[PDB]
Amino acid sequence: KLDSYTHLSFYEKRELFRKKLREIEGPEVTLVNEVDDEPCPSLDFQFISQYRLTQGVIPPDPNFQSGCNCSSLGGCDLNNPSRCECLDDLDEPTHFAYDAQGRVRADTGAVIYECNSFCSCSMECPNRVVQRGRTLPLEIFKTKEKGWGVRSLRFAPAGTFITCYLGEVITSAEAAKRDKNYDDDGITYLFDLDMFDDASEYTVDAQNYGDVSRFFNHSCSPNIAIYSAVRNHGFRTIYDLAFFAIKDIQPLEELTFDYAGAKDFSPVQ
Numbered sequence: 016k017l018d019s020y021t022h023l024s025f026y027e028k029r030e031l032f033r034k035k036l037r038e039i040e041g042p043e044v045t046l047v048n049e050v051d052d053e054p055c056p057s058l059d060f061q062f063i064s065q066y067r068l069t070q071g072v073i074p075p076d077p078n079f080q081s082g083c084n085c086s087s088l089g090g091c092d093l094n095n096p097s098r099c100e101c102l103d104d105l106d107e108p109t110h111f112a113y114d115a116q117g118r119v120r121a122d123t124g125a126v127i128y129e130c131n132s133f134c135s136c137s138m139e140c141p142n143r144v145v146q147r148g149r150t151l152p153l154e155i156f157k158t159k160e161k162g163w164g165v166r167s168l169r170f171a172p173a174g175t176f177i178t179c180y181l182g183e184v185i186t187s188a189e190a191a192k193r194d195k196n197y198d199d200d201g202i203t204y205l206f207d208l209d210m211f212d213d214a215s216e217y218t219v220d221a222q223n224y225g226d227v228s229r230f231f232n233h234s235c236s237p238n239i240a241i242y243s244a245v246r247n248h249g250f251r252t253i254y255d256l257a258f259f260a261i262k263d264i265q266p267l268e269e270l271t272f273d274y275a276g277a278k279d280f281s282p283v284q
C-alpha cells in the first residue's frame with residue numbers, strides 16, 4: 016500500500032544501512048526483515064571498534080601497565096599458569112581463561128586477564144582472544160514482537176567469544192544527564208562498568224556509537240554472557256564488556272543476554 020516514492024525511499028534507506036554494515040571490519044553482518052516493511056533500524060549512529068571516551072572520563076593510563084614476558088614461541092602456553100604476570104592478579108585455581116580451542120574454559124570466572132601490548136607474544140597468543148575480535152558472521156533482523164535483534168549465522172560452541180559491547184564511556188554523572196533526555200525510547204543502551212570499585216562510576220552508552228552488540232536483546236534464558244576482560248590489571252576503572260556464548264548456539268538462533276554481574280557466574284547457587 017506504499018506509493019512509489021515511499022517504496023523507493025525505504026529501498027534506499029535499507030541499502031544505506033547495508034552499506035554501513037559492509038564497512039564494518041570483520042566477519043559479515045547482514046540485515047533482514049521478514050516481519051514488516053520497516054527498512055532498517057535508525058541510521059543515526061556510528062559503528063566503532065574501540066571505546067569512545069568523553070569529557071570528564073579519565074581512562075586507565077597504559078603507562079603503568081604490567082607486561083608478561085613469558086612468551087616462548089607461540090603465545091604464552093596455557094600450561095604455565097605460574098609464568099604469566101597477567102595472571103598475578105589472583106592465584107587459587109590458577110589457569111588461563113581459555114583452552115586451546117580459543118573458547119572460554121568453564122573453570123574461568125567473570126574476569127579474564129589478557130596479555131597487553133607490553134607483553135612479548137604475537138597476536139596469535141592464546142591469551143589474546145577478545146583482542147582478536149569477532150569471528151562469527153551475524154545478522155540483524157526484525158523479531159515479531161520485539162524490535163530488531165541479532166542472530167548467529169553459524170553454529171557457535173558454548174564458550175565461544177562473540178563480540179564486545181562498545182560505546183561512549185561517560186561518567187555516571189552525564190549518564191543521568193542523558194537519563195533526563197531519554198523520552199519515548201523503547202531501548203536505553205546503558206551499561207554500567209561497576210564490576211569492581213564503584214568510585215569511578217563509569218557507564219558505556221551505545222546510543223550514538225557502538226558495535227553490532229548494541230542490537231542484542233535481553234532475555235531470561237540468554238545464550239551469551241558478559242565477561243569483564245582486562246588488560247590494565249592495575250586500573251579496572253574501564254575494562255572490556257565481552258560476550259561469550261554460554262551454551263551451544265544453533266545457526267540462525269537469536270542472541271540474547273541479561274547482565275547479572277559476578278552474581279550468576281561463580282555461584283552454582
Ligand code: NI
Pocket residue numbers: none
Ligand atoms: Ni531485501
Ligand SMILES: [Zn+2]
Pocket residue numbers: 083084085086090091098099100101130
Ligand atoms: Zn604470558
Ligand SMILES: [Zn+2]
Pocket residue numbers: 082083084091099100101129130131134
Ligand atoms: Zn601477558
Ligand SMILES: [Zn+2]
Pocket residue numbers: 083086090091130131134135136140142
Ligand atoms: Zn601473551
